[PDB]
Design a protein around this motif. Sequence first.
Motif, PDB file in Angstrom:
ATOM      1  N   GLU A  25      67.818  12.026  -4.905  1.00 43.10           N
ATOM      2  CA  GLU A  25      67.006  11.902  -6.109  1.00 43.10           C
ATOM      3  C   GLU A  25      67.675  10.971  -7.091  1.00 43.10           C
ATOM      4  O   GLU A  25      68.903  10.987  -7.260  1.00 43.10           O
ATOM      5  N   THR A  55      61.411   8.534 -11.739  1.00 44.67           N
ATOM      6  CA  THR A  55      62.059   9.606 -10.993  1.00 44.67           C
ATOM      7  C   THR A  55      61.508   9.552  -9.588  1.00 44.67           C
ATOM      8  O   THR A  55      60.294   9.626  -9.403  1.00 44.67           O
ATOM      9  N   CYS A  57      62.159  10.982  -5.486  1.00 45.72           N
ATOM     10  CA  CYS A  57      62.823  11.874  -4.544  1.00 45.72           C
ATOM     11  C   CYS A  57      62.850  11.227  -3.186  1.00 45.72           C
ATOM     12  O   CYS A  57      61.931  10.495  -2.807  1.00 45.72           O
ATOM     13  N   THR A  72      70.716  21.900  -7.727  1.00 53.52           N
ATOM     14  CA  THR A  72      69.691  20.862  -7.793  1.00 53.52           C
ATOM     15  C   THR A  72      68.315  21.412  -7.439  1.00 53.52           C
ATOM     16  O   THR A  72      67.296  20.932  -7.937  1.00 53.52           O
ATOM     17  N   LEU A  74      67.060  21.332  -4.410  1.00 54.19           N
ATOM     18  CA  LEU A  74      66.519  20.579  -3.280  1.00 54.19           C
ATOM     19  C   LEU A  74      67.071  21.074  -1.955  1.00 54.19           C
ATOM     20  O   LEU A  74      68.147  21.668  -1.886  1.00 54.19           O
ATOM     21  N   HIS A 173      67.872  21.914 -13.952  1.00 53.92           N
ATOM     22  CA  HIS A 173      68.986  21.261 -13.275  1.00 53.92           C
ATOM     23  C   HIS A 173      68.450  20.347 -12.179  1.00 53.92           C
ATOM     24  O   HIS A 173      68.246  20.749 -11.033  1.00 53.92           O
ATOM     25  N   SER A 174      68.210  19.106 -12.577  1.00 54.67           N
ATOM     26  CA  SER A 174      67.701  18.067 -11.703  1.00 54.67           C
ATOM     27  C   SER A 174      68.278  16.760 -12.200  1.00 54.67           C
ATOM     28  O   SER A 174      68.917  16.732 -13.247  1.00 54.67           O
ATOM     29  N   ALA A 175      68.046  15.677 -11.471  1.00 58.25           N
ATOM     30  CA  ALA A 175      68.438  14.366 -11.950  1.00 58.25           C
ATOM     31  C   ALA A 175      67.775  14.102 -13.303  1.00 58.25           C
ATOM     32  O   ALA A 175      68.449  13.781 -14.289  1.00 58.25           O
ATOM     33  N   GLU A 176      66.457  14.265 -13.355  1.00 56.58           N
ATOM     34  CA  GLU A 176      65.717  14.016 -14.586  1.00 56.58           C
ATOM     35  C   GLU A 176      66.235  14.877 -15.727  1.00 56.58           C
ATOM     36  O   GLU A 176      66.421  14.400 -16.848  1.00 56.58           O
TER      37      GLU A 176
ATOM     38  N   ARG B  53      59.214  20.996  -7.515  1.00 60.98           N
ATOM     39  CA  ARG B  53      60.543  20.411  -7.611  1.00 60.98           C
ATOM     40  C   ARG B  53      60.569  19.004  -7.029  1.00 60.98           C
ATOM     41  O   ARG B  53      61.270  18.132  -7.545  1.00 60.98           O
ATOM     42  N   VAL B  54      59.823  18.783  -5.950  1.00 58.20           N
ATOM     43  CA  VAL B  54      59.703  17.441  -5.391  1.00 58.20           C
ATOM     44  C   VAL B  54      58.538  16.720  -6.073  1.00 58.20           C
ATOM     45  O   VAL B  54      57.383  16.809  -5.644  1.00 58.20           O
ATOM     46  N   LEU B  55      58.879  16.002  -7.132  1.00 57.68           N
ATOM     47  CA  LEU B  55      57.916  15.390  -8.032  1.00 57.68           C
ATOM     48  C   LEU B  55      58.374  13.988  -8.418  1.00 57.68           C
ATOM     49  O   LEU B  55      59.356  13.839  -9.138  1.00 57.68           O
ATOM     50  N   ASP B  56      57.685  12.959  -7.931  1.00 56.66           N
ATOM     51  CA  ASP B  56      57.968  11.595  -8.367  1.00 56.66           C
ATOM     52  C   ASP B  56      57.267  11.312  -9.702  1.00 56.66           C
ATOM     53  O   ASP B  56      56.103  11.666  -9.891  1.00 56.66           O
ATOM     54  N   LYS B  57      57.978  10.655 -10.616  1.00 56.84           N
ATOM     55  CA  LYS B  57      57.436  10.340 -11.934  1.00 56.84           C
ATOM     56  C   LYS B  57      57.610   8.872 -12.294  1.00 56.84           C
ATOM     57  O   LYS B  57      58.647   8.284 -12.008  1.00 56.84           O
ATOM     58  N   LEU B  58      56.590   8.303 -12.938  1.00 48.67           N
ATOM     59  CA  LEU B  58      56.664   6.969 -13.513  1.00 48.67           C
ATOM     60  C   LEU B  58      55.966   6.947 -14.860  1.00 48.67           C
ATOM     61  O   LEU B  58      54.788   7.299 -14.956  1.00 48.67           O
ATOM     62  N   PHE B 102      55.882   2.486  -6.411  1.00 49.23           N
ATOM     63  CA  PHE B 102      55.743   3.917  -6.654  1.00 49.23           C
ATOM     64  C   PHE B 102      54.710   4.555  -5.725  1.00 49.23           C
ATOM     65  O   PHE B 102      54.968   5.589  -5.085  1.00 49.23           O
ATOM     66  N   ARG B 105      55.660   4.796  -2.076  1.00 44.24           N
ATOM     67  CA  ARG B 105      56.591   5.886  -1.789  1.00 44.24           C
ATOM     68  C   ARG B 105      55.858   7.194  -1.456  1.00 44.24           C
ATOM     69  O   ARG B 105      56.475   8.159  -1.018  1.00 44.24           O
TER      70      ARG B 105
END
Lengths: 211, 220
Positions: A25, A55, A57, A72, A74, A173-176, B53-58, B102, B105
Motif C-alpha cells: 500500500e 491511495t 493497494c 495494517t 491487510l 492504522h493504514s498508509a493513508e 480496508r482494500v480501498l483505492d482513493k484519488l 487509477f 488498477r
Amino acid sequence: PRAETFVFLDLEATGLPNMDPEIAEISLFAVHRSSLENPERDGSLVLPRVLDKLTLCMCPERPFTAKASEITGLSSESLMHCGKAGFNGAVVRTLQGFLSRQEGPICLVAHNGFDYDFPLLCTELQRLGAHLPQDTVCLDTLPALRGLDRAHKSYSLASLFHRYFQAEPSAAHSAEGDVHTLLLIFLHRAPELLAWADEQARSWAHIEPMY
Amino acid sequence: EPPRAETFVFLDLEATGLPNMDPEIAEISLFAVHRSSLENPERDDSGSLVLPRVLDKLTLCMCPERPFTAKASEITGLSSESLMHCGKAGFNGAVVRTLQGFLSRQEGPICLVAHNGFDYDFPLLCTELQRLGAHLPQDTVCLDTLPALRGLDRAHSGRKSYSLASLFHRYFQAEPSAAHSAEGDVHTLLLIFLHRAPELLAWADEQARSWAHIEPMYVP
C-alpha cells in the motif's frame, strides 16, 4: 529553488525479512507550500482544503508477518481477493500522473523515510525503469524532529502525535491514516520543518535502492 | 443487458456552478471498491458499518478556466484564487493520465457510482473527458444512487428528500464526518451505499447504464 509542493507519503511493505521487499500500500497527500506556511485552524489544526490524494493497494507476492497484519489490517490474500495486482506499470503511470499535477519542485516527506519508504520506493521504480522529476528532493521527519529537539524520547508517530496534540490519533492504522497523522505533526512544527527542508532536504537522485 | 461489474468506483465532483453556466470541475474524488467488499459489508464489533480496508482513493483539485459562482465557492469551499495559489492547473492531460492509471488498477468491468450522476456528475465528467478526447474502459457502466434509491423505496413500499445529506441522516441518524468536500461526499455516498448494498448491487446488475451512452452536459 525551494520546493513548491510537499508530498507526504507512507508505504506498507512485506518481504523485508527476505530482503525481497514488496509494497502492499502507498498513500500520498500533496500539499502546497503556502498551506504549510499559513496553517488553517477551526482552535485546533485542520488539513489544507486544497489537497491532492492518492491511495493504492497492491497484492504483494510475499506475506505480511502476523504482527504487521494486525496493525495494517491487510493480508496478501485479501488484497488479491479485492483484485489487486502488484506494483506495476499502471501504478507508475498513476503515480507519475499524480506528481505531474503538483507544482514543482516536489519535496517527498516520509517518517523514517531514509531507512524504509524512500529506498523501498526507489527499488520498485528502478525495477520498472521509472524516474521522478530530477529536481525532486526529500525529507525524513524522524531525524528532522530529533535534530530540531537537539538544537534546544520516542520519535514514533504514535508518541509524537500524543506529545503535540494531547490525544491519540483516531486515524486508522493504514498508509493513508499514517500520512494524515504525519501531516498534522508536520503542521504542528511547520515553520521549523520548512526551514529544515530548505537546508537539509536530500536530492531524490541521491537515494539508493534496497536491491 | 449490463455486464456484472467487479469494481464500483464511487465518485463526486465539486463544480463551479449549475449546468446553465457551463460549469467546470474544481475537484474530483474517487473511491474504488471491489464488489466483494459490497457483498459482505464489514462491520466493527459494535456492529456499525466501516469502510472497506482494500480501498483505492484519488482526489484531485483543479483550477477552472472560468470563475466559480458565489454559491459554488461557498458550497465547495474552493475559489479560483486558492486553487491558483496552490499551483493547480485545470482539467488537463495530467488529470486524464492519473484517472486512467487509477481505473486501470481496478478489476473490470467498472461501475461508476455518483449521487444524482445521470443529471450532473456523469454528463459533466463526459464533457471534460470528451474535450480532451479521453475514453474510459470499454465496458464501463454507471449507477445513479438517487433514482436507484427512489425506485427501491417505491417497490419496497417515508421519506421525502433523496439528497445525499438527507439520506445519510435518515440511514445513520447523525451528521456526516465529511468535510463538505468531494472526498467527504464520496465517503458519505459509500456509507449510504453500504447501508443498502444488496439492494443496490442487484439494481446495478440489471439497471446500470453504459458509460458510452452518457451525453456531455455541454459543448466546451
